Scaffold this active site. Sequence first.
Site, short mmCIF file in Angstrom:
data_model
loop_
_atom_site.label_atom_id
_atom_site.label_comp_id
_atom_site.label_asym_id
_atom_site.label_seq_id
_atom_site.Cartn_x
_atom_site.Cartn_y
_atom_site.Cartn_z
CG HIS B 41 -0.61 0.08 2.55
ND1 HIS B 41 0.28 1.39 2.85
CD2 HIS B 41 -0.90 -0.71 3.47
CE1 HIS B 41 0.22 1.08 4.26
NE2 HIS B 41 -0.30 -0.29 4.55
N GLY B 143 2.34 6.19 10.48
CA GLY B 143 3.85 6.11 10.22
C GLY B 143 4.38 4.66 10.73
CB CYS B 145 2.22 1.08 7.59
SG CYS B 145 0.47 1.45 7.92
N1 LIG Z 1 -5.69 5.49 10.18
C1 LIG Z 1 -4.48 5.33 11.28
C2 LIG Z 1 -4.20 5.68 12.57
C3 LIG Z 1 -3.63 5.36 13.50
C4 LIG Z 1 -2.61 4.36 13.37
C5 LIG Z 1 -2.71 3.90 11.99
N2 LIG Z 1 -1.95 2.25 12.18
O1 LIG Z 1 -2.16 1.45 12.64
O2 LIG Z 1 -1.29 2.31 10.79
C6 LIG Z 1 -3.41 3.99 11.11
C7 LIG Z 1 -3.74 3.47 9.62
O3 LIG Z 1 -4.21 2.33 9.33
N3 LIG Z 1 -2.78 3.60 8.82
C8 LIG Z 1 -2.45 3.31 7.45
C9 LIG Z 1 -2.11 4.06 6.29
C10 LIG Z 1 -3.60 3.63 6.47
C11 LIG Z 1 -4.20 2.72 5.57
C12 LIG Z 1 -5.59 3.17 5.32
C13 LIG Z 1 -6.77 1.96 4.87
C14 LIG Z 1 -6.17 0.79 4.42
CL1 LIG Z 1 -7.04 -0.36 3.95
C15 LIG Z 1 -4.65 0.49 4.65
F1 LIG Z 1 -4.13 -0.75 4.45
C16 LIG Z 1 -3.93 1.63 5.10
#
Ligand SMILES: Nc1cccc([N+](=O)[O-])c1C(=O)N[C@@H]1C[C@H]1c1ccc(Cl)c(F)c1
EC number: 3.4.19.12
Lengths: 301, 302
Positions: B41, B143, B145
């Site tokens: 992604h 950040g 991921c």
């Molecule tokens: N929104 C967040 C807030 C706090 C912490 C996190 N986290 O734990 O990474 C997120 C989050 O999901 N970030 C991802 C890049 C975002 C994304 C969004 C949708 C889809 Cl399906 C994906 F694969 C990826």
Amino acid sequence: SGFRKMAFPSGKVEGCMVQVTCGTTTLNGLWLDDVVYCPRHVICTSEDMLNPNYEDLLIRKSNHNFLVQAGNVQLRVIGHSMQNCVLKLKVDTANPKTPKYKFVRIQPGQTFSVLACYNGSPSGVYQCAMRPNFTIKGSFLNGSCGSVGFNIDYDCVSFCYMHHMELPTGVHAGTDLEGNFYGPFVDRQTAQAAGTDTTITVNVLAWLYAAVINGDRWFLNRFTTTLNDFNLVAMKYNYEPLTQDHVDILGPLSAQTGIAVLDMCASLKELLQNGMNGRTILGSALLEDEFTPFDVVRQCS
Amino acid sequence: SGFRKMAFPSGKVEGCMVQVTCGTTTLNGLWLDDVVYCPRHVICTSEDMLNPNYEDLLIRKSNHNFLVQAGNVQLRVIGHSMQNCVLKLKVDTANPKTPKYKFVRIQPGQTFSVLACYNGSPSGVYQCAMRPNFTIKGSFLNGSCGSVGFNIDYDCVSFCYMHHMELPTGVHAGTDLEGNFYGPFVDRQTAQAAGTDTTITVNVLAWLYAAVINGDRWFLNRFTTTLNDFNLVAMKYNYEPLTQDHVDILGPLSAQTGIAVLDMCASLKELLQNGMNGRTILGSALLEDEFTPFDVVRQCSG
Ligand SMILES: Nc1cccc([N+](=O)[O-])c1C(=O)N[C@@H]1C[C@H]1c1ccc(Cl)c(F)c1
Ligand SMILES: Nc1cccc([N+](=O)[O-])c1C(=O)N[C@@H]1C[C@H]1c1ccc(Cl)c(F)c1
Ligand code: NA
């Protein structure tokens, strides 16, 4: 989101752990530049431990009585001295993996990571606080002596704890890296018992602020309190007094959530009175006191 | 004595964490030999993330579109390809700090250490279990991921998890290092939710054995039970069924403490039925299910 007891990455400390042997005793040492730091009780037999005269034991030792093993390699000991309750062994090689570091002596309430080690080999990492009674609730087996506690703010490792012994109640006692014990403890087998422990009130409040930041408001109420009234109630549940310093320290969490410190104190009073009534806060059914104001800001913002 | 949620030492994994940037997205990558692994992604914008065609987005990228930073040094990307939900970036330098490693897929109930990272810089380590519902209760900000989960089984790191996303209830979802998701999740912005979770019964019993080893004995009783009777109780309280395999695995702890597994199940039955009555076990007012039998043995005997 989420909220976890999180330790610092241990790699900078792992590359400093060595095994120190004297006679039949083996424990862990910390190898920084050309010095290995370990508990002075490595020079004792168990008989010695009731009333050891460390100066007398140590004068009878030469350099070659100390075996230091760093992974597979023997280091040569070229000097030794005692500073307070730590032995400092001068070795012939500077540790090439020496991180940027400092020695810091911490206060009760402060948290740190522990790298538990056996035979100079790291076993696991976990997060601890210095309890008001100057012990730590660690996880340590025989052979863990000389394992260290540390923070890493930036690239600089702050060593704050070296493990020396387990007390009869199953909690742990040790020194700063200058070899001064935390608490009234001594490296002797005497009747020494941890003072009754108390809850670290400033850390509980910090954690309540973390719960609010993470979306959780159920425990708030419409009340406030004076600081003195809060302290009179808190002490009845074996909570540490909250000082104006603690109130000051919580200022930033106060500003972020829009909940005044003494307003959060009123919430804490009510929680102590009512319990949680089947609810959890950040996944806990107990009030957590091992996250500091600094740690909440680090993990949450 | 003492019993703590304990992670493996993270040093071997720290030396493999890098920062991967593509367009405006920066996240973390795992650099092993001459490949950097990260969530596919990374190639998507917000719009793309609604309905991404990964193969189509990827074919439009050149090597130089991927900026990989290992501490202070830029690595040069010389190839890119996809395996399932992970992007594999071939770089010009083998990682000199590559540990002995394997990629392993873990089962629900199994635990692992997570090294949380931001901008390819490790910030914290904590211990997780893979939930029955295939999520993890992690602690992650934007950040994070590409942060990875692992066990160490000698000098060998077994990588089992790479972080991809947070779900609406604040729990986390990701893949093994071959890019297969744990759980029925997809790397796109649709409505997705954690399914209802259950308690990992074998792990709770493990933790009860840890409590006994550490001198916490108040919940032991004279009673025993059968698997079927216990399993009727488990089901009622949203506990996973206990199988003969579970009983076998707890064999060592049983022998050491002199409390048979079904003996300890009789304790657990009573706890589920009557609660703790004001008492705690290893400092907890809830039953902990994120230590495996192996974790207890490892911490309580090694
Ligand atoms: N929104 C967040 C807030 C706090 C912490 C996190 N986290 O734990 O990474 C997120 C989050 O999901 N970030 C991802 C890049 C975002 C994304 C969004 C949708 C889809 Cl399906 C994906 F694969 C990826
Ligand atoms: N034997 C143990 C069992 C489990 C865990 C531990 N532990 O956490 O270290 C020990 C323990 O206390 N080891 C020390 C050598 C023993 C000693 C005994 C007394 C005094 Cl004053 C001292 F400084 C040193
Ligand atoms: Na029983």
